[PDB]
Amino acid sequence: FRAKIVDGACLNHFTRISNMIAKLAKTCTLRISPDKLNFILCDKLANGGVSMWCELEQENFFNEFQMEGVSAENNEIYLELTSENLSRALKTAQNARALKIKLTNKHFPCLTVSVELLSMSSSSRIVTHDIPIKVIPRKLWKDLQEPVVPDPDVSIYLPVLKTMKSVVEKMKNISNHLVIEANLDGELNLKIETELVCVTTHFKDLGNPPLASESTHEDRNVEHMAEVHIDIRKLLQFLAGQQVNPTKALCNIVNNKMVHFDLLHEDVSLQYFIPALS
Amino acid sequence: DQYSLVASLDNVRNLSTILKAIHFREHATCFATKNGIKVTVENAKCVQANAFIQAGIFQEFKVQEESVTFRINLTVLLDCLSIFGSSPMPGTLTALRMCYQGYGYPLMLFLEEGGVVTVCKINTQEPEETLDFDFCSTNVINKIILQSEGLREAFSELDMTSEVLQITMSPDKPYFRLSTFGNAGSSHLDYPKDSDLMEAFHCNQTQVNRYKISLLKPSTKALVLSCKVSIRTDNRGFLSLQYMIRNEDGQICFVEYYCCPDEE
Amino acid sequence: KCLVTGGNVKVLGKAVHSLSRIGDELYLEPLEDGLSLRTVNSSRSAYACFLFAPLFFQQYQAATPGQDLLRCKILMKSFLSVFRSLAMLEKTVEKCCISLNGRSSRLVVQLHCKFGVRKTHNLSFQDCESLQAVFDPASCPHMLRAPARVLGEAVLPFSPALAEVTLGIGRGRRVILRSYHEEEADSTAKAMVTEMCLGEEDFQQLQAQEGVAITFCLKEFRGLLSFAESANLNLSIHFDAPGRPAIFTIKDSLLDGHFVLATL
């Protein structure tokens, strides 16, 4: 059993995360955890299903919100829904007062976003109650449907994620294959090449992150150079939801088979993973 | 360098739009003379659509031999000179383009807007010379300028059926008539002279002609965000020469729909 | 003849639009107390009429003479797209006159717009007329009167723009509920339930009958709701159980609006 309240514009800050979810994933999986863990996970059948992991701590944006299930062998609990129902249910509460969220019983166990609103017309009460239709996933599935992984090939800060985007919509007209190039000199190249037309794009003047090891200087070395690798209109998916240009934007190409993205903007960090062939 | 053609712009949007304003068929023939570029859309043998940008609008224009001509994906071209921008600002969009002997047609574009500048490199190829199609410049009968505003407003009723133009006979006050004929619905638009600013009429003999509306359709829609000349010939046929007065940041721009059928 | 002028032009346009989401054909009845705008369901399950007092018109005529069928029938989409795709193009101030004629070709609607007049002729062939006065009285014991605005509030929460089932219910104890439902719920079978519920006195008038529901198609409803302009007062009159429909009436100065939607 599980129950929460939201009260502020934290509310809207929660609302635009859920549409920030509905818009890049059709059937996310949500984990209420102990008092500070709220993530959204994407993979039902569909093979990998890319992989989106999105932690947002409930720590800050909530008055009271409690947690405990007759959960086997742990206290973190997972449950999964059609992403709409969270979002639809949510974008009618960005207007004022409150919103309770909790699991139901019979009538087909579900997520139940109770949502209160102001009734200016003298002293009335007005309440909505939306029932998302959800599945608590099995004991075992927990282990095997995890997203986090620490991976270091080539990292770089991203341009305007909406100027970048203004491009992909046009590229997807011309080809379905996309090649990603990044650099040690803030360079970035969006690349289509079909037989009738070849279209490429050069995103100069960026940055690059530095990590370190256990030593007494800057760090170790390798023997690497520039970094290519191909993809699809999956890039265009993660891009369409980024309507508030992330406060930190990242793209770590991994050795010609991964593409990582590390978005964190204000409190809500969001991670997105595109694979490389066809 | 050494090339059929080279052209730099500082504002792509001048080629972009006027180009955009004739884009219905998949491809186009852009014959480039030493005077500018005229790109032409040829529908089904009853509709030319022309589009002539003179070089004086290109901030730099150069052409080796009087023949520079070719076909290109009009769709996939236009898609490139708007690679990133439905929404500009005080920031601008630049175009530069370099063609030669009969293999490759590349384009160079950068955009600058509040923090970084972005070069994008395009290369669209060239197919056949196709079947040249040349219409009429014989004689005019009645000529008629109308307004940018009012006549797009009038196009409001989407009829999808048939077209008839009309131009009346009187000592002073004429009339100019549109009319559609669809499933239960004849509908008539006609403009009298009052408040004609550059909206001048030359009705000189009485005349009424017929157009299939299936061809002229893209014309009005896609091109007439600006004001036109309606001129009906009667020399080698009876046919419509809409040619619209378009323009960006003050320049001699024009495109040109000749059209000519009866019924069907 | 019936001449609407000025701002009233929009109010019938919006008035007609509301009917245009209840059926596919329009029963334009003139009658000395006003032009009536009738229309029924694709299925004869739910009807809708909008009456307009002669006073709102500049001119109005339907004089007694004859038992000639002065009732004009018309594809809703051939009339609406005349009536939605015109006035919203308001220049400085225009005038409209629906000129019904006695003798021959049924309907003529035409628009004045300074210079350049538009004139749609609506052939309403298939010589046929449905008819009868249908003023089904306060047949229902339940009356609900509400600022139309407030009724919107209630539809905002569960508003996919697709919800056929919506269950208006006067249950609990003087709190109006608005649930909806479907029960099928296995391996992949689905249904998400939304309930909006409302203050007692958030309504002008609530006649209480604890625990009676009525499910009507929220598409049709929304139609009369959308005409939630000028803070019109909405009126929900319904009898119990299914057959006996709901009556969604709207009172005004010259507008009389009336909506029958059959409760499932």
From Swiss-Prot, chain A:
It comes from Homo sapiens (Human). It is found in: Nucleus; Cytoplasm, Cytosol. Component of the toroidal 9-1-1 (RAD9-RAD1-HUS1) complex, composed of RAD9A, RAD1 and HUS1. The 9-1-1 complex associates with LIG1, POLB, FEN1, RAD17, HDAC1, RPA1 and RPA2. The 9-1-1 complex associates with the RAD17-RFC complex. HUS1 interacts with POLB, HDAC1, FEN1, PCNA and RAD9B. HUS1 does not interact with RAD17. Interacts with DNAJC7. The keyword Cytoplasm applies. Component of the 9-1-1 cell-cycle checkpoint response complex that plays a major role in DNA repair. The 9-1-1 complex is recruited to DNA lesion upon damage by the RAD17-replication factor C (RFC) clamp loader complex. Acts then as a sliding clamp platform on DNA for several proteins involved in long-patch base excision repair (LP-BER). One of its GO terms (biological process) is DNA repair. Signal peptide: none annotated. Keywords: Cytoplasm, DNA damage, Nucleus. Belongs to the HUS1 family. GO terms for cellular component: checkpoint clamp complex; cytosol; nucleolus; nucleoplasm; nucleus; site of double-strand break. This is Checkpoint protein HUS1. Ubiquitous. InterPro entries: Cell_cycle_HUS1, DNA_clamp_sf, Hus1/Mec3. The lineage of its organism: Eukaryota, Metazoa, Chordata, Craniata, Vertebrata.
From Swiss-Prot, chain B:
Keywords: DNA damage, DNA repair, Nucleus. Its main location: nucleus. This is Cell cycle checkpoint protein RAD1. Expressed in testis, uterus, bladder, spleen, ovaries, lung, brain and muscle (at protein level). Component of the 9-1-1 cell-cycle checkpoint response complex that plays a major role in DNA repair. The 9-1-1 complex is recruited to DNA lesion upon damage by the RAD17-replication factor C (RFC) clamp loader complex. Acts then as a sliding clamp platform on DNA for several proteins involved in long-patch base excision repair (LP-BER). GO terms for cellular component: checkpoint clamp complex; chromosome; intracellular membrane-bounded organelle; nucleoplasm. Disulfide bonds: none annotated. It comes from Homo sapiens. Component of the toroidal 9-1-1 (RAD9-RAD1-HUS1) complex, composed of RAD9A, RAD1 and HUS1. The 9-1-1 complex associates with LIG1, POLB, FEN1, RAD17, HDAC1, RPA1 and RPA2. The 9-1-1 complex associates with the RAD17-RFC complex. RAD1 interacts with POLB, FEN1, HUS1, HUS1B, RAD9A and RAD9B. Interacts with DNAJC7. Interacts with RHNO1; interaction is direct. CDD domains: PCNA. It is found in: Nucleus.
UniProtKB/Swiss-Prot annotation, chain C:
One of its GO terms (molecular function) is enzyme binding. The keyword NAD does not apply. GO terms for biological process: cellular response to ionizing radiation; DNA damage checkpoint signaling; DNA damage response; DNA repair; DNA replication checkpoint signaling; intrinsic apoptotic signaling pathway in response to DNA damage; mitotic intra-S DNA damage checkpoint signaling; positive regulation of intrinsic apoptotic signaling pathway in response to DNA damage. Its main location: nucleus. It is an enzyme of class 3 (hydrolase). Its EC number is 3.1.11.2. Changing Y27F: Abolishes phosphorylation by ABL1. Keywords: DNA damage, Exonuclease, Hydrolase, Nuclease, Nucleus, Phosphoprotein. One of its GO terms (cellular component) is cytoplasm. It is found in: Nucleus. Residues 50-90 are annotated as: Possesses 3'-5' exonuclease activity. The modification Phosphotyrosine is found at Y27. It catalyses: Exonucleolytic cleavage in the 3'- to 5'-direction to yield nucleoside 5'-phosphates. Constitutively phosphorylated on serine and threonine amino acids in absence of DNA damage. Hyperphosphorylated by PRKCD and ABL1 upon DNA damage. Its phosphorylation by PRKCD may be required for the formation of the 9-1-1 complex. The keyword Nucleus applies. Belongs to the rad9 family. Component of the 9-1-1 cell-cycle checkpoint response complex that plays a major role in DNA repair. The 9-1-1 complex is recruited to DNA lesion upon damage by the RAD17-replication factor C (RFC) clamp loader complex. Acts then as a sliding clamp platform on DNA for several proteins involved in long-patch base excision repair (LP-BER). Component of the toroidal 9-1-1 (RAD9-RAD1-HUS1) complex, composed of RAD9A, RAD1 and HUS1. The 9-1-1 complex associates with LIG1, POLB, FEN1, RAD17, HDAC1, RPA1 and RPA2. The 9-1-1 complex associates with the RAD17-RFC complex. RAD9A interacts with BCL2L1, FEN1, RAD9B, ABL1, RPA1, ATAD5 and RPA2. Interacts with DNAJC7. Interacts (when phosphorylated) with TOPBP1. This is Cell cycle checkpoint control protein RAD9A. The gene is RAD9A.
